[PDB]
Amino acid sequence: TASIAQARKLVEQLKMEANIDRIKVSKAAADLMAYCEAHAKEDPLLTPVPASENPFR
Amino acid sequence: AAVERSKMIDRNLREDGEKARRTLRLLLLGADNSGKSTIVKQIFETKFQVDKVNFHMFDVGRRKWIQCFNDVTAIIFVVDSSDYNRLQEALNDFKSIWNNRWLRTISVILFLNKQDLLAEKVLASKIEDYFPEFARYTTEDPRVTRAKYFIRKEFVDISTASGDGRHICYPHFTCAVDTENARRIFNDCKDIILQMNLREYNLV
Amino acid sequence: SELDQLRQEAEQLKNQIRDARKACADATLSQITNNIDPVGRIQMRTRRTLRGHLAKIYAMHWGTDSRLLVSASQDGKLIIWDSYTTNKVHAIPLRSSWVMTCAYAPSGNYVACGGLDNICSIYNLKTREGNVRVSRELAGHTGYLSCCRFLDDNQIVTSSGDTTCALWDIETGQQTTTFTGHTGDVMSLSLAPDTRLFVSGACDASAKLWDVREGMCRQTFTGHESDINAICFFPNGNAFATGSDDATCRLFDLRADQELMTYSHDNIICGITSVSFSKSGRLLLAGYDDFNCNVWDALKADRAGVLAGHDNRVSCLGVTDDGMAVATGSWDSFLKIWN
Amino acid sequence: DYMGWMDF
Amino acid sequence: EWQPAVQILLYSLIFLLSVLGNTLVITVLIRNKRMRTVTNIFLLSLAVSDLMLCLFCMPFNLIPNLLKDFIFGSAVCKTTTYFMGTSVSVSTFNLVAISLERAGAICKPLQSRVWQTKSHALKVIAATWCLSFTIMTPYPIYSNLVPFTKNNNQTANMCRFLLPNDVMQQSWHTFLLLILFLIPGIVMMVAYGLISLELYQLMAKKRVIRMLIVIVVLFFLCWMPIFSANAWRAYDTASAERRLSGTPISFILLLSYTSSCVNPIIYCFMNKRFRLGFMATFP
């Protein structure tokens, strides 16, 4: 009867997964995009810094 | 003072690699009731010595972690030849190992253990009931020799269907009382290194 | 009849999940990011080469200060590097040479290492005797360890090949919480920036979101075709990226609960070994089996650069907390600092 | 007759 | 003037082919780090030494024969003689080193793992180069122009190398005939014979054994005539100079120079791995 208990466990897992709230993928993608342009200026990899600031010459 | 510390550390690592380079590393593979631990009389590991050459054998107590052993000298693969029910599983496992993406250049030393049990079973016959193609096979007891050669051929056909000469299989028939397995491994590793040298020195 | 009813209920629940995700999917990340300008070619160049390892490198981790880093190699040595001057600060001899992961404590006082020994070993870097010593050996996993990350000086999360993740209390040396639900071996791990959640990737092509305090699985993602090898949170903490043997990368969103974007090209046929994000999060850096490292525009999926220069498989990868430099390890036995 | 050569 | 026509034609042929081959080998070996093994270090050494031999021997050895006069200065005479001797010594010792490395790797594959390393190869290359530079010291000392007048009352010279006495001249030439021809020849024959014996005791194995035979045959045919002629001159200069002056010694020198032409061909251009590297490097 262990297989029955396992199947009940997956049933509960999928019930919990269905009970979660979700937001529109358009809004989520807009949020990640907005984060990216918000913190773009602080990223040295997408825009190299001059050798005066670069610690690795 | 820091750079001196770094240089001392680097000297220590160089001296460590010097000692590490002198051992040949071997991967032990096989299923249950194969008899892996009995092969050599001397992540588990074991060590033994033949003719001033150091061998260090490893067997993990399989797909993902096999990548760690893509640089060993040889893979030692053990198969139980006493019974025929598991022989198809052993052949499939051997094919999976031989055709592995990360093991394409590693030779396999094949051990077919409990040949005494196989001889007893044959002389005292059901192998045809598991392999219909064993019927009318040809080339100690002649029937036992026929069965041994049939099983060895079954492994060697898989071993030769692919490989392109990058690596080859070395089948052996061994028993529990056979103590020559270390010497066989030593000779096989000598052959593997010789074949590597022929390519690496532009001779072949 | 109970088992059949449970199976039918599971199928109905999975169909409802799929329908909820389909209703959620009103637009595509590629359509949203159509108007943004591309980053252009990412011309990164090697700046340091860290020599001293005499075998394949499997793992590296940056320190909280962007100077020090630790790397693990199957020569049996764990080396702490001063990346500014390439000096070797420490060289830790390991009890087992088959290691596969390494972590550097956020405080800087400890490092962790593990592999085919089914043990996570903690090393004290700030002892009073001047040498490095083991603090505790965390035993209890039944498979090999594939990733580990410190939460603090006393809390560390590990993933294992035994399909389970664990949370540890280092002082006691016992598992505080066990995480279960994966069916394939867990290969990667990534703590959230707020350290309240983490995601893991498994060989069953699935990614799960876990709750550290509760110990329960929140979400499950299954877009990949083959085993997932690498995982890493987006800097915002609301998304993550995975790399698979199927030779693709996917970006998922936690609040959207589904795939957002895939990073693939027809020429690439090898699997991804490691992934990481930059400071801004717009660049996604992935290591491949083709000996190269490719830079992906995580918002546009366009390939922006290549970190060529390694002569063997790129096993590891890591970006600094400041975002100044990237370190890549390889089976060539050399680590390289880029940009 | 510029006889002889250089050794090599 | 058919004989001079053939002489300069062949000089140009072997010169161009050896230069191009050595340059290609040097470029491929220096570019593909993957193609950097113990034997490949010695191959690069041999390519550099063959280029040195070609450049410092062949153009300076046809002129004094065509114009019967040494036109260059004493500095050029001394430098060219030193470089020719150095290149010959380095080439011969690199060949012996390659033969010994191969013999060890094929005869004791596991025992030779201890010492067949890149650092050991670097030690060997450095020792060979330094030993050659040290031993070839007397040539820039005793190389000087000997003047003579021609029938047209014109000036002329003979860059030449003469020790103060004929006895020590003979000793020097015997020492060269030993160390640059005889001992290396016996060592290479023994090494490749052992390699062939071990490898034989299949169509590919016969090919590689015949290649090992070709190596020794080419070495002996290329280097026997010139050393024999030098020994003949040391023992009785008059007869040797009368017989071999002009085209015969020029052609013997060309036969000697052909070793630098053939060595890249046998050692690299017949290797599949190398050919692949060349195709990957050049368009």
Author numbering:
A (entry chain G): 6 to 62
B (entry chain A): 18 to 59, 207 to 225, 231 to 254, 265 to 303, 306 to 320, 330 to 394
C (entry chain B): 2 to 340
D (entry chain P): 1 to 8
E (entry chain R): 38 to 238, 305 to 386
The authors write:
Tyr1403.51 is a key residue in the CRAC motif, which is situated low in CCK1R TM3 and is critical for the functional impact of high cholesterol and other sterols on this receptor. Disruption of this specific CCK1R CRAC motif by replacing Tyr1403.51 with Ala (Y140A) can eliminate the cholesterol sensitivity of this receptor by mimicking the function of this receptor in elevated cholesterol, with this construct exhibiting increased binding affinity of CCK-8 and reduced CCK-8-stimulated intracellular calcium signaling. Resolution of these complexes was 2.51 Å for CCK1R(sterol 7M) and 2.59 Å for CCK1R(Y140A). These structures required stabilization of the receptor complex through use of a guanine nucleotide-insensitive G protein analogue, with further stabilization of the bound heterotrimer by scFv16 that spans the αN helix of the chimeric Gα subunit and Gβ. Under these conditions, there were no substantial structural differences between these constructs and when compared with WT CCK1R (approximately 0.7 Å Cα RMSD for receptor residues for both CCK1R(Y140A) and CCK1R(sterol 7M) compared to CCK1R), other than the presence of the specific mutant residues that could underlie the observed functional dissimilarities. At the CCK1R, photoaffinity cross-linking of a CCK-8 analogue with a photoactive residue at the C terminus (residue 33 of CCK(1–33)) indicated that this residue has a predominantly superficial orientation sitting at the surface of the lipid bilayer adjacent to TM1, whereas mutagenesis data also support a deeper pose, similar to that proposed for CCK2R.
Type 1 cholecystokinin receptor (CCK1R) agonist actions are affected by increased membrane cholesterol, enhancing ligand binding and reducing calcium signaling, while agonist actions of the closely related CCK2R are not. Indeed, an unbiased approach, utilizing systematic domain exchange within chimeric CCK1R/CCK2R constructs to identify the region of CCK1R responsible for its cholesterol sensitivity, demonstrated that a cholesterol-association (CRAC) motif ((L/V)-X1-5-Y-X1-5-(R/K)) in transmembrane segment 3 (TM3) of CCK1R was responsible for the functional impact of changes in cholesterol levels. In summary, CCK1R is sensitive to elevated membrane cholesterol, disrupting its normal stimulus-response coupling primarily by stabilizing Gq/11 interaction leading to a reduced CCK-8 dissociation rate, higher apparent binding affinity, and lower potency for intracellular calcium signaling. In contrast, CCK2R is insensitive to elevated cholesterol, with slower G protein activation and slow peptide off rate, even in a low cholesterol environment. These distinctions in receptor function are dependent upon differential cholesterol interaction with a specific CRAC motif in TM3 located in proximity to intracellular loop 2 of the receptor, a region that is known to be important in G protein activation.
